Amino acid sequence: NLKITNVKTILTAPGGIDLAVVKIETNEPGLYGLGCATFTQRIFAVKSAIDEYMAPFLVGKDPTRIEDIWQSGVVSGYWRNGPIMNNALSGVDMALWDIKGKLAGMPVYDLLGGKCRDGIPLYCHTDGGDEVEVEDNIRARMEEGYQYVRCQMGMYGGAGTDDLKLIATQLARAKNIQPKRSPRSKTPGIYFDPDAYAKSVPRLFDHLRNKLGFGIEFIHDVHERVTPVTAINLAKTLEQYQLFYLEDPVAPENIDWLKMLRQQSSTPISMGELFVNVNEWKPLIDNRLIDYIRCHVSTIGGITPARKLAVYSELNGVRTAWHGPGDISPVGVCANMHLDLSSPNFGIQEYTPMNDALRDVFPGCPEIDHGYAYLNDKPGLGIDIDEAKAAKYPCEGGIPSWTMARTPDGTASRP
């Protein structure tokens, strides 16, 4: 007669980025589950969604009924399909998977069908103010054993970032990108020039291919920064550089434009870190408009819907590339990886390296060894949280600044 007894939210920032973790307790002594609910920009609203709504929904129920709980949970507020709602559901769903693995004495990847590969290949982020600094940073990552890298010159749209809420790191604006002149007064924002950015990208990859060759795999993230036809043209101009993928050429609001892109370009495309709705990803995958699906697993509602998405992708020849930024807890990192190891159609795993504090707060972080991640074989997600240590890193709260992105004339843009 196993029952959920308690559900709680833990808010912690050991890597300098606000995280939300759900812990689900049961009436079996010592048996609990952990899940990721990290929507970093709205952590307090996520906490409210869990504590005020998911907790009374769950206490008393048999945690082994993961699918029933997910299906009933998703419709429990009637309205649904949003990032706050989905993250609250995810924390619950991953915790239940964690509990199921612990009961079975099996890692989640074994519950899901077992290992389809011997390690998880990773990509990491490289940046710089000019092409030489990017090149230097790639060399350093290659020395560490990375065989795949994302290359940005000036973060997103060439703008860099001063906002530590984004990745806990300041990144330089592109040094030599010359923006258009703005009007005589400016509304506050982080200014960028989408056209100057777009033209800089082929020049960057020309330099990088010249210096580093074609063995190393390259990723570039457009991050919805340009008009769709500009993104199409960029995809075409980048064909010669043979990117592993070109990421987020359009906003989710503009997914129809991928119909045109895919008639003209053979540069591999990834989309979807922003997706929260089946009506965003289903038309893309059904029509083969992408080669990699990029969802943030917690933001689509956890392991249960991510595995459905992985299967839907697999049957259409689309591969997975789950979102792996700084704004994901080590629990969510483990969840991505259990999916990765058990999916036939795994593509790549984006990885943001952790500091000592994250490894200390979350015992059981995956082993990173020469560009591959190696999950432990402990039951469930193989991850724990030290609640006392978590409390040493309280969340900063507040609002980000980087999301106020303005084009030269002052237009508020999708960031």
315 binds its own copies (CB under 8 A): no
Residue 370 annotated to the active site: no
> Which of these ranges, 147-155, 169-177, 274-282, 307-315, lies near its own copies under the rule CB under 8 A?
274-282
Is 350 a known ligand-binding residue?
Answer: yes
> Which of these ranges, 37-45, 92-100, 205-213, 311-319, lies near its own copies under the rule CB under 8 A?
37-45
Nearest alpha-carbon partner for 18 in 402, 414, 390: 390
398 binds its own copies (CB under 8 A): yes
Is 294 a known ligand-binding residue?
Answer: yes
Beta partners for residue 376, in sequence order:
none
255 binds its own copies (CB under 8 A): yes
Distance of CA 143 to the CA centre of its chain: 25
Please identify which of the residues 32, 146, 197, 223 carries the catalytic annotation: 223
Is 125 a known ligand-binding residue?
Answer: yes
* # of chain residues touching its own copies (CB under 8 A): 52
Residue 210 · residue 134 · CB < 8 Å = no
Q: Is 27 left (phi over 0), alpha (psi -120 to 50) or beta?
A: alpha
Is 296 a known ligand-binding residue?
Answer: no
224 binds Mg ion (CB under 5 A): no
**Span 165-224, contacts to its own copies by CB under 8 A:** 187, 189
350 binds Mg ion (CB under 5 A): no
Beta partners for residue 123, in sequence order:
350
Is 314 a known ligand-binding residue?
Answer: no
Is 273 a known ligand-binding residue?
Answer: yes
* CB-based burial label for 114 (10 Å; 0-12, 13-18, 19+): exposed
Nearest alpha-carbon partner for 84 in 37, 21, 33, 52: 37
127 binds Mg ion (CB under 5 A): no
Is 387 a known ligand-binding residue?
Answer: no
> Quick one: CA dihedral 248, 250, 253, 256, positive or negative?
negative
Beta partners for residue 171, in sequence order:
161
Instruction: Mention every residue, 6+ apart, whose C-beta is less than 8 A from residue 16.
Output: 164, 168, 326, 355
CB nearest Cl ion: which residue? 82
Draw the binding track, 87-126, toward its own copies (x: CB under 8 A; -: no contact). Answer: ----------------------------------------
Q: How far is CA 346 from CA 51, 145, 250, in A?
A: 34, 20, 23
Strands 319-320 and 292-293: parallel
Among 135, 221, 280, 327, binds Mg ion (CB under 5 A): 221
* CB atoms inside a 10 Å sphere around CB 57: 19
Q: Which residue, 79 or 214, has its beta carbon nearer to its own copies? A: 79
Residue 31 · residue 380 · CB < 8 Å = no
* CB atoms inside a 10 Å sphere around CB 52: 10
Q: Which residue, 53 or 374, has its beta carbon nearer to its own copies? A: 53
308 binds its own copies (CB under 8 A): no
Please give the Cα distance from 324 to 307 (Å, whole number).
Answer: 16
- Indicate which of Cl ion, its own copies, Mg ion, none lies near residue 207 (CB less than 5 to 8 Å, by partner kind): none
Is 239 a known ligand-binding residue?
Answer: no
Q: What is the dihedral of CA 42, 48, 51, 54, to 10 degrees?
A: -80
Q: How far is the CB of 45 from Cl ion (least distance, A)?
A: 8
- Angle, CA 357 vertex, CA 109 and CA 296 arms, to 5°: 45
Nearest alpha-carbon partner for 392 in 350, 345, 360: 360
Q: How far is the CB of 297 from Cl ion (least distance, A)?
A: 16
**Number of residues that this document lists for the chain:** 415
Beta partners for residue 319, in sequence order:
292
Residue 338 annotated to the active site: no
Please give the Cα distance from 345 to 331 (Å, whole number).
Answer: 22
Draw the binding track, 128-167, toward its own copies (x: CB under 8 A; -: no contact). Answer: ----------------------------------------
174: its two tokens: 């592109």
- Indicate which of its own copies, Cl ion, Mg ion, none lies near residue 221 (CB less than 5 to 8 Å, by partner kind): Mg ion
Q: How far is the CB of 300 from Cl ion (least distance, A)?
A: 12
Q: Residue positions in the annotated binding site for substrate? A: 41, 125, 273, 294, 323, 327, 350
Footprint of its own copies on this chain (CB under 8 A)? Answer: 39, 41-42, 44-45, 47-49, 52-53, 56-57, 68, 71-72, 75-86, 187, 189, 252-253, 255, 274, 276-280, 283, 296, 299, 397-400, 403-405, 412-415
- Which residues participate in the annotated binding site? 41, 125, 221, 247, 273, 294, 323, 327, 350
Please give the residue ranges that form the binding site for Mg ion (CB under 5 A): 221, 273
Active site residues: 156, 223
